[PDB]
Amino acid sequence: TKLKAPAVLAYSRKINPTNALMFAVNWSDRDNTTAVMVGTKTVAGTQSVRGNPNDADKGNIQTVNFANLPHNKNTLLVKYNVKFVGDVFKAELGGGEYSNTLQTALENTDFGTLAYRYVYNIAAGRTLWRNRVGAESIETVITVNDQTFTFSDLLVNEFDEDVDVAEIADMVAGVLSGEGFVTLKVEHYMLLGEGSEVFPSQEFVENSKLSKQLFDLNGQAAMHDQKIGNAIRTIDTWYEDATTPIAVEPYGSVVRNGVAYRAGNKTDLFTLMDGAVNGKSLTEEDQMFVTANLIRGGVFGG
Amino acid sequence: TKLKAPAVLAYSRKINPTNALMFAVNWSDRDNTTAVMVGTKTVAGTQSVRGNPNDADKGNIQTVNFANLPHNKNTLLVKYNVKFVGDVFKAELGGGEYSNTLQTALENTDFGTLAYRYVYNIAAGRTLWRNRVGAESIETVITVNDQTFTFSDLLVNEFDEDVDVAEIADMVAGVLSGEGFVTLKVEHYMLLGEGSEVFPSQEFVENSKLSKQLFDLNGQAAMHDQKIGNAIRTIDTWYEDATTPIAVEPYGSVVRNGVAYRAGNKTDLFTLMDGAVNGKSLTEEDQMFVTANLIRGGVFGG
DNA sequence: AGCAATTTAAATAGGGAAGATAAGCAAAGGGTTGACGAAAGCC
DNA sequence: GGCTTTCGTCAACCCTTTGCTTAT
Numbered sequence: 197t198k199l200k201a202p203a204v205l206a207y208s209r210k211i212n213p214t215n216a217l218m219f220a221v222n223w224s225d226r227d228n229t230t231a232v233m234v235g236t237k238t239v240a241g242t243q244s245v246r247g248n249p250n251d252a253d254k255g256n257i258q259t260v261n262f263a264n265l266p267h268n269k270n271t272l273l274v275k276y277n278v279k280f281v282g283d284v285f286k287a288e289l290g291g292g293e294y295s296n297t298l299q300t301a302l303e304n305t306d307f308g309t310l311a312y313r314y315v316y317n318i319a320a321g322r323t324l325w326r327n328r329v330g331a332e333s334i335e336t337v338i339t340v341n342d343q344t345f346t347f348s349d350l351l352v353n354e355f356d357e358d359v360d361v362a363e364i365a366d367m368v369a370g371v372l373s374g375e376g377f378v379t380l381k382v383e384h385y386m387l388l389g390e391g392s393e394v395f396p397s398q399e400f401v402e403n404s405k406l407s408k409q410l411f412d413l414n415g416q417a418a419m420h421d422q423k424i425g426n427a428i429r430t431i432d433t434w435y436e437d438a439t440t441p442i443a444v445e446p447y448g449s450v451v452r453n454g455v456a457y458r459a460g461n462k463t464d465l466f467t468l469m470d471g472a473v474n475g476k477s478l479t480e481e482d483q484m485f486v487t488a489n490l491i492r493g494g495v496f497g498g
Numbered sequence: 499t500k501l502k503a504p505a506v507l508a509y510s511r512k513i514n515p516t517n518a519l520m521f522a523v524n525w526s527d528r529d530n531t532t533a534v535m536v537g538t539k540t541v542a543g544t545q546s547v548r549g550n551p552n553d554a555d556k557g558n559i560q561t562v563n564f565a566n567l568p569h570n571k572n573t574l575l576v577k578y579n580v581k582f583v584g585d586v587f588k589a590e591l592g593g594g595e596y597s598n599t600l601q602t603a604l605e606n607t608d609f610g611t612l613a614y615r616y617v618y619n620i621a622a623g624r625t626l627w628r629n630r631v632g633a634e635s636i637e638t639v640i641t642v643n644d645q646t647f648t649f650s651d652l653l654v655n656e657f658d659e660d661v662d663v664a665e666i667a668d669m670v671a672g673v674l675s676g677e678g679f680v681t682l683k684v685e686h687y688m689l690l691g692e693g694s695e696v697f698p699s700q701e702f703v704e705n706s707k708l709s710k711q712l713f714d715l716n717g718q719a720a721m722h723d724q725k726i727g728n729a730i731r732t733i734d735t736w737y738e739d740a741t742t743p744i745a746v747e748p749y750g751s752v753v754r755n756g757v758a759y760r761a762g763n764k765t766d767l768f769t770l771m772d773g774a775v776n777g778k779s780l781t782e783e784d785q786m787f788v789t790a791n792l793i794r795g796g797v798f799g800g
Numbered sequence: 801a802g803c804a805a806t807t808t809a810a811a812t813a814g815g816g817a818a819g820a821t822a823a824g825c826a827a828a829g830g831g832t833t834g835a836c837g838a839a840a841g842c843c
Numbered sequence: 844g845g846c847t848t849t850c851g852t853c854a855a856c857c858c859t860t861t862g863c864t865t866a867t
Contacts, residue, residue: 238702244748252749252758257816330581330679391516453593547812557809800819
């Protein structure tokens with residue numbers, strides 16, 4: 197009794213977004229996709245840090261990788277492909293009598309609600325992040341298996357009920373609960389303005405000669421595959437005292453806020469996984485969380 | 499109590515101006531816009547260092563970038579779009595406790611007066627800097643949400659009463675004290691003269707083959723987006739011995755003056771924000787300073 | 801069908817912001833390489 | 844009378860993890 201985790205238990209990605217490519221179009225003609233480019237401005241500023249107050253009367257010179265829309269183009273086009281591969285409960289590391297019993301304990305999970313909020317975040321354009329502020333109207337074109345879907349007025353933090361998101365959901369939930377793959381060809385149009393600053397994912401640079409280093413693909417401004425995939429899995433409204441959706445993590449970690457919303461109150465992924473393999477009746481909002489971390493992937497052993 | 503600021507606390511800018519362009523028009527016909535082309539002249543000057551009195555018997559040859567009005571056009575047109583986005587009190591980095599008991603510490607702040615001085619600095623033409631001097635009349639055309647506004651004779655230093663910079667500020671203080679965005683599409687007509695010198699923002703150069711590199715956008719003369727945004731925030735008239743408006747900075751620093759007005763005498767932002775969070779009754783003229791800094795953004799941690 | 805002039809000077813200064821993190825697993829094999837000396841069939 | 848094969852005897856660790864100079 198008391199079935200424990202395998203020492204090496206890990207799961208693969210079942211949501212596989214590509215790197216987003218940032219293009220400039222207009223709101224009328226969306227086919228002449230001018231590619232925005234990361235430029236390098238060197239910016240004079242002020243030294244305002246919380247510790248040093250005697251360094252206040254000095255400037256700081258920080259060269260910054262910047263990405264702006266061209267002044268003749270008023271719409272940012274964010275183009276990426278999201279790949280919803282199947283075989284969620286199968287582990288790429290470990291799994292004997294644990295992954296196979298987690299399969300039989302996560303069999304009756306609401307995958308329709310799980311894959312709905314997975315493609316709602318795609319449809320409502322949560323993957324844009326800072327590209328959403330100041331946008332007049334965000335238009336999202338999704339081209340999955342020669343079917344084009346268009347979304348304009350979707351409120352992001354409230355997962356509302358519309359027909360078209362529930363129609364990409366029933367072809368993704370069939371894969372996530374089954375076997376195969378479904379790829380969505382996402383195209384995000386937002387009317388920011390002429391010359392408005394677009395916001396790619398900044399890169400980690402250790403030493404650097406640049407204060408900002410923006411992600412580039414052949415010099416064109418781009419977003420990380422992990423930044424796009426972060427907002428797609430921002431479906432967790434099932435944590436304790438839930439107000440806003442958070443990204444599914446094994447500890448519900450929001451490191452940008454510095455607070456873990458799933459750790460220390462017996463509601464984290466590992467405790468519910470142990471209860472599921474040991475025989476605890478998982479709640480549906482917790483069963484969805486456990487099978488949503490298996491779609492996120494990660495190492496769940498140790 | 500003494501709830502400390504988080505190590506990673508940061509707000510984003512809620513004033514997002516595009517990098518300004520520079521066009522050349524006439525005062526009567528304001529629609530035949532040409533592009534102010536940044537040229538490259540080579541001066542022959544004097545070596546006039548404070549030291550080296552043994553010099554200035556030799557020459558000084560430097561090549562600089564110059565942008566001048568065409569001699570058939572007597573009016574410089576400076577075009578940019580200011581984006582006043584909302585959700586000011588929500589921090590991109592950090593959040594919870596310190597940010598949330600500062601959002602509910604800055605809630606009776608006079609947001610009308612803040613947005614009053616914010617759009618009066620886009621109406622008095624303070625975003626033009628050295629393009630202001632020598633102008634006969636600086637006429638500003640601000641078009642927001644399909645109603646244009648014209649301003650021609652506003653005093654730049656005195657925030658005086660005007661009924662049409664207050665109607666714009668009503669659309670801005672309904673955004674800055676809430677959620678959403680608004681976009682002022684600003685045009686700046688100044689009757690400088692025929693063939694006069696316009697003054698774009700100068701780019702920082704490290705290699706420095708040139709001695710003065712003006713900012714260019716595909717050859718067009720241009721001002722930096724952080725330079726236009728620097729003069730929008732020049733609203734701080736509530737420090738010790740206030741004479742002229744400076745930009746709101748966390749220390750009240752003017753790097754071109756070498757002094758910091760708010761730093762040191764217990765009125766800079768960090769020792770005002772900490773007092774507002776901890777429970778000190780903030781004055782109105784310092785509450786607007788703190789939320790003007792939150793509109794400006796920056797790191798406010800550690 | 802070669803000829804293209806010389807000197808002279810190339811800017812002084814001020815700024816290059818810090819705060820966070822940098823995973824935990826589990827594996828890492830043995831198989832030959834023995835010389836001296838003493839039973840024990842064997843020329 | 845050696846002599847040449849094969850079996851029988853006798854054991855027991857503590858390890859360390861790049862420069863040596865460096866061109867007529």
